[PDB]
Design an enzyme around this catalytic site. Structure first.
Site, PDB file in Angstrom:
ATOM      1  N   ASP A 481      39.463  63.583  52.227  1.00  0.00           N
ATOM      2  CA  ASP A 481      39.750  63.403  51.012  1.00  0.00           C
ATOM      3  C   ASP A 481      39.116  62.168  50.444  1.00  0.00           C
ATOM      4  O   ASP A 481      38.252  61.361  51.072  1.00  0.00           O
ATOM      5  CB  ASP A 481      41.581  63.261  51.042  1.00  0.00           C
ATOM      6  CG  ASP A 481      42.115  63.621  49.871  1.00  0.00           C
ATOM      7  OD1 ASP A 481      41.464  62.728  48.741  1.00  0.00           O
ATOM      8  OD2 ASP A 481      42.916  64.585  49.752  1.00  0.00           O
ATOM      9  N   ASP A 836      47.134  67.603  50.805  1.00  0.00           N
ATOM     10  CA  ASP A 836      46.006  68.159  51.743  1.00  0.00           C
ATOM     11  C   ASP A 836      46.918  69.100  52.898  1.00  0.00           C
ATOM     12  O   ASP A 836      46.165  69.573  53.456  1.00  0.00           O
ATOM     13  CB  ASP A 836      45.815  66.864  52.515  1.00  0.00           C
ATOM     14  CG  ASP A 836      44.772  65.944  51.854  1.00  0.00           C
ATOM     15  OD1 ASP A 836      43.848  66.735  51.490  1.00  0.00           O
ATOM     16  OD2 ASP A 836      44.853  64.786  51.860  1.00  0.00           O
TER      17      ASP A 836
HETATM   18  F1  BEF Z   1      43.773  61.751  47.692  1.00  0.00           F
HETATM   19 BE1  BEF Z   1      44.369  62.263  49.403  1.00  0.00          BE
HETATM   20  F2  BEF Z   1      45.970  62.397  49.197  1.00  0.00           F
HETATM   21  F3  BEF Z   1      44.023  61.230  50.476  1.00  0.00           F
HETATM   22 MG   LIG Z   2      45.392  60.684  49.089  1.00  0.00          MG
END
Ligand code: BEF
Ligand SMILES: [Mg+2]
Length: 1118
Positions: A481, A836
């Site tokens: 992410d 996520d």
């Molecule tokens: F933007 Be992710 F939730 F790290």
């Molecule tokens: Mg984040």
């Protein structure tokens, strides 16, 4: 409309956690709206046989039928259930689209309130609710069908005058009964086989079979000892896993005091109390997070949705009007922009609220129907039952196929020579059938995974699924992410680019704080910029740390000054001494979004002249400025600092003289909003975590690919990936954009244009540039179009070449993770937020950075909030993979020698020794097996990957060849002793006193005790076996024990063992066979055995093929 002029918050948080592929009475069928399942709910009752005969069937069978039938429930429903309408029943079965049966029961609670408070007649006492995977299906009495959920939550707030009234009386009790508690409380794991099934390796299913062969008191002590050690290992592993899961759950619990407005009074309540309609309070402090997703009613606020969206910018919310409430419905998975503009979301960290006046807010959704709750609930729905045990589910197949040949060899002869037919099936059943896999194998694998889990938990990373630690060695790409994972969740000050008066241009980025001691004129631009940084903020100081608008907090922390209370007394410069004066704030104007600027009127102590300091967005200063001081590079630098991805603000000043200075400043805003001179830019960016760049560089340099799956703007994502090392420098990005109008049609065309150039690649058919390496950055909607409308080759080439994926909703994240796993590419996922959760369980090794969120069922959770945990959980995984195979190559080999240790004994019509086998298995195999699998990784993540295939030549050929070179040396010892004439070999012809049995037991003992050191694959991917304490001490002490058994056997062991006298010369020769076997095996396994496996040796992984195809096609210049 915000202060900055760059990328803006545009991604609304969605509850969708499953990707739907676009295509161009009783027993009802219904589909869950959030995740696509199309379940069937069938209601049965208990018939006139029921469990009355099932109980005695389970009792008289020994309980095996219950265990076998709980795994295969579909005919249990036929045997027990009776078909009735589910208006009046007590048993239900849940069917998925992949044919999995689940058994639930219906709870009944008297309600006695009309239908309008549950759905949408007055006489309603039935409240038939079924909680299937935290989905609460209720029974509609007017109809006869179960509804989808309680996601739509009875909207009765349209009047706009009862919205602020709140609930009172016993209505809250009935609402609590319907919608349940606000807390997302997952069902805690049960010790009665619910958690044990995760740790129950299928090899244990063979173990009880061995007990069937050992319940006849043939080995009274052996079966008890093996059961003891296996039960102990299983119990410790499951207890450690349960304690880790409960610990992660205990920091996963959230409760905060909230001033709920009920009955006309503000009462302090826990966070796990709210039910839809109880209007609650925001403005008071200690509300660090939003308890439940809600709707504003008074006052504006700024919140940070960096976990429900990938948006790094703190979104500002404004109160909802009457028209705003009359549009939304709680059953919507994704809210529109108008509704989201006036909306709080559950779990998002609150940044700032306004100061009996409050910021009161009406809760609309609670429980698992919140967006965080919906993502968490839909994370736990699917289950990969038979995914990872299948990789060992074929090894015993080829092992039994190999030993079938040995069984046929030994049965070709003894069938007629010296054994009858009825007796011969039991020596094969008792000995050969139980050592198809040795009983120490599933008790050593669990000990190895427990050692790996403890080694990880030493370095502040917890494992919730100890079966997943060996999967980490199969990882060749990690998916990351951006916000919270790689970069911090908030914007940070990058530098000051002031405009020099002499050159009429900008100067330099000025990352460090050199604004104080650099002058380079009625007012210096550097001093005015510093006064804007340390004065224009309307920050309410509380406890030394500033709170308010995150931009204002970050600039005030960057300048490092000391702001006093918000009145005519202003801040003081830092007294470090590194002649800059201090300035005080007279009056500040509110940041008007319509004007898109904020203004303050200050008064410096030194010059004693009035100052006006206004900061707002660029391309709005030039129409209120004095154009003689503006640099010519204004638009060029704006394009450079916005199209890269950063967000900038434009600050400017003007000088109010002494005669124009008024003590009572009743002077309008518009007087100081004209004729200002410009000073410079303040740049905001997502700062990388200080260790992220090094970890990404190491991971990319160690033959492990890296991509990035964020949820925010593609330009910020590209800049972060450029400055963290995901995209290698001076390599052009290539963004796909839809042309020819169509964006949701099957016949649309995509132009893959360079992100900062007119050049483009070829159309989707082949992703090659026009007439050197490059990367592909795909946004969200274009990827959603490609995955269901573009051809298979186009999707594969994008997934291979892609390195940045932005504006991705959670379902699209899960789809991209699966599409990596659609081809034989094994990808982990380094996520943290509630975005996520869809892409964390679907991935193989899902590391959760957030301790509380996205860690309810993620296989790993890091205490340290950076990417430094990704190396260990990879490298230890490799150290937990090859070592596991180092048990698999060792234990199964242990079976084969045992067969020789039986087969040659069938030459003299003997079988084995009662005590020598017990000594071999317990006192020499276990101290080798469980202590060989105790060593950490090399602390250097190597580029080469371990052999992770149980079909390939690199495992089978060394195993079979080691077995054969063991059989040859054991047969050499046997032929030696048979033709050795000093002592005749007594074939007595059950028989246990053979000298041949002793001289073969000692040779096979040396075989077992030397095969553990050679097969210990410690040097490449672990600590070297030179470490004396873990493994060398155990092998040394058991070798000394064996030598004491051989060279100088005491009389006491003669009472135990059945050994006979042996000459010193033969004993020396025996030691020579042991040492020549060790030398041969050590020089073979490292130099010759793998050489033979390679020289003896299609179906290559799809990703590699695409790599060769793309690289080769690019060599021919198209
Ligand atoms: F933007 Be992710 F939730 F790290
Ligand atoms: Mg984040």
């Amino acid at each position: 409309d915000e202060l900055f002029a760059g990328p803006v918050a545009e991604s609304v948080p969605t509850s969708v956690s499953a990707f739907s592929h676009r295509h161009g009475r009783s027993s009802q069928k219904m589909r869950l709206d959030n995740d696509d399942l199309t379940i069937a709910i069938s209601g049965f009752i208990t018939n006139r046989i029921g469990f009355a005969i099932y109980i005695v069937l389970c009792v008289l069978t020994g309980g095996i039928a219950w265990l076998f039938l709980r795994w295969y429930p579909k005919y249990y429903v036929k045997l027990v259930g009776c078909a009735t309408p589910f208006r009046d029943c007590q048993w239900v079965v849940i069917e998925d689209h992949f044919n999995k049966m689940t058994i639930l029961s219906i709870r009944v609670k008297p309600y006695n309130r009309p239908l309008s408070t549950v759905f949408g007649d007055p006489v309603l006492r039935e409240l038939r609710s079924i909680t299937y995977c935290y989905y609460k299906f209720y029974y509609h009495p007017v109809l006869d069908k179960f509804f989808c959920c309680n996601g739509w939550k009875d909207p009765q707030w349209n009047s706009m005058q009862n919205a602020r009234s709140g609930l009172h009386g016993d209505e809250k009790a009935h609402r609590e009964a319907v919608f349940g508690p606000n807390s997302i409380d997952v069902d805690e794991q049960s010790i009665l086989q619910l958690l044990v099934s995760e740790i129950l390796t299928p090899f244990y299913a063979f173990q009880v079979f061995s007990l069937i062969l050992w319940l006849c008191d043939e080995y009274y002590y052996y079966a008890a000892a093996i059961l003891l050690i296996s039960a102990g290992s299983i119990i410790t592993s499951l207890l450690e896993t349960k304690e880790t899961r409960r610990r992660l759950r205990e920091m996963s619990r959230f409760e905060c005091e909230v001033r709920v407005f009920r009955g006309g009074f503000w009462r302090t309540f826990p966070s796990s109390d709210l039910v839809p309609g109880d209007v609650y309070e925001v403005s008071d402090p200690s509300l660090t997070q939003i308890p439940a997703d809600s709707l504003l009613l008074t006052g504006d606020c700024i919140v940070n949705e960096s976990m429900l969206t990938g948006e790094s910018v703190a979104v500002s919310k404004t109160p909802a009007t009457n028209e705003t409430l009359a549009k939304l419905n709680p059953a919507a998975s994704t809210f529109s922009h108008d509704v989201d503009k006036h909306f709080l979301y559950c779990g998002t960290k609150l940044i700032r609220a306004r100061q009996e006046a409050a910021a009161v807010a009406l809760v609309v959704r609670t429980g698992f129907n919140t967006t965080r709750g919906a993502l968490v609930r839909s994370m736990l729905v699917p289950k990969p039952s038979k995914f990872k045990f299948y990789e060992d589910s074929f090894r015993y197949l080829k092992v039994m196929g190999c030993l079938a040949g040995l069984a046929f060899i030994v049965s070709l002869v003894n069938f007629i020579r010296l054994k009858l037919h009825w007796t011969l099936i039991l020596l094969r059943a008792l000995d050969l059938l139980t050592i198809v896999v040795p009983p120490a194998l599933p008790a050593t694998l669990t000990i190895g995974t427990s050692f790996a889990v403890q080694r990880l938990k030493g370095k502040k990373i917890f494992c919730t699924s100890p079966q997943r630690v060996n999967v980490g060695g199969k990882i060749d790409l990690m998916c990351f992410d951006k916000t919270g994972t790689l970069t911090e969740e908030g914007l940070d000050v990058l530098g000051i680019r002031v405009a020099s008066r002499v050159s009429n241009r900008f100067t330099e980025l000025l990352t460090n704080v050199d604004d104080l001691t650099w002058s380079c004129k009625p007012l210096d631009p550097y001093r005015a910029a510093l006064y804007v940084m340390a004065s224009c903020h309307s920050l309410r100081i509380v406890d030394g740390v500033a709170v308010g608008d995150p931009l204002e907090v970050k600039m005030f922390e960057f300048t490092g000054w000391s702001y006093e209370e918000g009145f005519i007394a202003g801040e003081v410069i830092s007294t470090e001494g590194r002649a800059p004066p201090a300035v005080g704030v007279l009056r500040a104007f509110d940041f008007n979004p319509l004007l898109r600027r904020s203004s303050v009127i200050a008064r410096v102590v030194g010059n004693s002249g009035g100052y006006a300091l206004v900061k707002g967005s660029p391309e709005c200063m030039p129409e209120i400025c004095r154009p003689e001081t503006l640099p010519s590079d204004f638009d060029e630098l704006l394009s450079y600092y916005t199209h890269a991805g950063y967000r900038v603000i434009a600050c400017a000043t003007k000088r109010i003289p002494k005669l124009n200075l008024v003590s009572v400043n009743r002077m309008t805003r518009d007087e100081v909003e004209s004729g200002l001179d410009f000073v410079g830019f303040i740049i905001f960016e997502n700062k990388l975590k200080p260790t992220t760049t090094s970890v990404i560089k190491e991971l990319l340099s160690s033959n492990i690919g890296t991509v990035m799956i964020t949820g925010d703007n593609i330009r910020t994502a590209v800049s972060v990936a450029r400055q963290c090392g995901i995209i290698e420098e001076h390599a052009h990005c290539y963004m796909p954009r839809f042309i020819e109008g169509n964006a949701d049609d099957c016949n649309a065309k995509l132009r893959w244009e360079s992100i900062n150039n007119p050049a483009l690649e070829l159309d989707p058919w082949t992703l090659l540039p026009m007439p050197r390496n490059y990367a592909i950055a795909v946004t969200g909607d274009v990827f959603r179009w490609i995955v269901d409308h573009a051809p298979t080759d186009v999707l594969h080439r994008m997934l291979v070449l892609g390195k940045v994926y932005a504006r991705m909703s959670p379902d699209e994240k899960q789809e991209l993770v699966k599409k990596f796993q659609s081809i034989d590419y094994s990808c982990g996922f380094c996520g943290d937020g509630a975005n996520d959760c869809a892409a964390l369980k679907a991935a193989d090794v899902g590391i959760s950075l957030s301790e509380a969120e996205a860690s309810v069922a993620a296989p790993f959770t890091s205490q340290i909030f950076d990417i430094r945990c990704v190396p260990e959980v990879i490298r230890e995984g490799r150290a937990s993979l090859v070592t596991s195979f180092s048990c698999f190559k060792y234990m199964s080999l242990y079976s084969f020698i045992q067969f020789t240790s039986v087969s040659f004994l069938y030459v003299s019509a003997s079988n084995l020794g009662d005590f020598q086998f017990l000594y071999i298995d317990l006192m020499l195999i276990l101290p080798i097996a469980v202590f060989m699998s105790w060593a950490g990784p090399h602390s250097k993540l190597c580029a080469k990957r371990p052999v992770s295939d149980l079909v390939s030549r690199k495992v089978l050929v060394p195993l079979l060849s080691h077995v054969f070179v063991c059989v040859m040396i054991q047969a050499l010892a046997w032929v030696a002793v048979r033709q050795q004439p000093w002592y005749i070999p007594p074939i007595v012809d059950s028989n246990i006193e053979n000298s041949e049995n002793t001289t073969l037991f000692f040779a096979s003992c040396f075989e077992y005790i030397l095969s553990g050191v050679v097969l210990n694959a410690g040097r490449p991917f672990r600590q070297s076996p030179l470490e004396t304490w873990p493994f060398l001490s155990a092998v040394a002490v058991t070798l000394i024990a064996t030598l004491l058994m051989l060279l100088v056997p005491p009389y006491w062991l003669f009472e135990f063992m059945q050994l006979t006298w042996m000459s010193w010369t033969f004993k020396i020769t025996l030691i020579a066979f042991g040492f020549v076997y060790f030398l041969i095996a050590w020089t073979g396994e490292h130099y010759l055995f793998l050489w033979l496996a390679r020289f003896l040796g299609k179906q290559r992984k799809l990703y590699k093929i695409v790599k060769e195809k793309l690289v080769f096609e690019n060599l021919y210049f198209q």
